[PDB]
């Protein structure tokens, strides 16, 4: 389901009802109201899905503080009405990550999509993973969006030019033999942050991070 364009969201509600009927409600069999729960890792659009269904069916409006950085909804929320005809309510939950994320490569994909805060991982390290993945995939969307060169696979090289494109610079202390001197330098950090934002905004192009695993 595409939340922003509400692609196929209508299909979810009939499926939700169909599965419930086959299953035995047990204690809640007599209760007419239907309550459902949405749970996932942070920044997967859980809250916006509740709002999207609410507007699509009940056409009322936002019922969740949607935000662009993980951690918006801190805890559980009261039942949110979704559809009057089946009287189905959605229960919002905060994103939860298991402490074990298997290989570190999975974390990079998890960080790339924004599920985990970019601070602890570091945009600079993440920015490299984007270049490797995009180059391996061959989707050279960035070169058109960022007019740097035909192609490149050096993280340092791409960061240098894009900063010039954005006209971003900063003053950074650089250790040298004769002392510590604050010498102006291109703003690499902004390039990583700005580059990362474009990828998740779709400017670079659609990607399949796990393309290698389909053959299995």
């Amino acid at each position: 389901t595409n939340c922003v364009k509400d692609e196929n969201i209508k299909q979810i509600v009939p499926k939700v009802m169909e599965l419930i009927r086959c299953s035995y409600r047990y204690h809640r069999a007599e209760t007419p109201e239907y309550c459902i729960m949405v749970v996932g890792v942070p920044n997967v659009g859980k809250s916006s899905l509740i709002n999207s269904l609410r507007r699509q069916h009940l056409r009322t409006g936002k019922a969740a503080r949607v935000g662009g950085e993980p951690g918006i909804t801190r805890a559980v929320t009261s039942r949110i009405q979704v559809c009057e005809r089946p009287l189905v309510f959605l229960l919002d939950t905060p994103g939860v990550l298991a402490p074990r994320i298997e290989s570190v490569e999975t974390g990079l994909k998890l960080a790339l999509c924004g599920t985990v805060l970019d601070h602890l991982v570091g945009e600079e390290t993440m920015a490299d993973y984007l270049l490797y993945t995009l180059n391996r995939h061959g989707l050279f969307g960035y070169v058109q969006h960022y007019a740097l060169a035909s192609a490149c696979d050096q993280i340092e090289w791409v960061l240098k030019n894009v900063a010039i494109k954005l006209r971003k610079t900063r003053k950074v202390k650089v250790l040298t033999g004769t002392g510590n001197v604050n010498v102006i330098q291109p703003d690499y950090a902004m390039a990583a942050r700005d580059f990362l934002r474009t990828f998740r905004s779709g400017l670079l192009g659609q990607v399949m991070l796990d393309r290698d695993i389909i053959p299995a």
Binding site: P32, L58, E84, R85, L87
Partner: protein, 154 residues
């Protein structure tokens, strides 16, 4: 143009005493809270309202507003007032008892979609039962006889 249809439908309006006309208009403004435009529209669309005595129209409107939850705009467009009270009560309850029609709840949401207001009243009895209720004509005749007896007891 508005007057000619009203004049033709109910010529006695001119002969009718000022009290009768004022009471009918006063009820809508002070007891039904109809908007000024709607009040003029209601008289034009169904001029028979003036013929009806006061304190019976008010019950008729409250039946639509409260029992059926319909808004003021809905009543004017569908011309509920022209239809007789007996016909509305028989059909509306029959639908309600059959589960087709539910009065909107406090939150304003109906679990099961209601049927078109025009379908309930405008269509003929044969078409009404055939489509709205999907029941036999003979059974409806029994219901009308049953409902009347209950009203007499009430």
């Amino acid at each position: 143009g508005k007057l000619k249809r009203v004049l033709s439908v109910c010529p006695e309006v001119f002969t009718m005493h000022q009290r009768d006309i004022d009471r009918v208009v006063k009820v809508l403004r002070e007891k039904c809270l109809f908007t000024a435009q709607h009040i003029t529209d209601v008289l034009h669309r169904c001029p028979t309202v003036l013929q009806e005595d006061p304190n019976e129209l008010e019950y008729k409107f409250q039946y639509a507003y409260f029992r059926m939850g319909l808004t003021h705009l809905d009543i004017v467009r569908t011309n509920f007032l022209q239809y007789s009270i007996t016909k509305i009560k028989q059909r509306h309850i029959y639908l309600e008892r059959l589960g087709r029609y539910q009065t909107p709840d406090k939150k304003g949401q109906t679990q099961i979609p209601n049927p078109s207001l025009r379908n309930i009243l405008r269509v003929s009895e044969a078409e009404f039962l055939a489509r709205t209720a999907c029941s036999s004509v003979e059974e409806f005749q029994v219901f009308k006889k049953l409902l009347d007896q209950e009203e007499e007891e009430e």
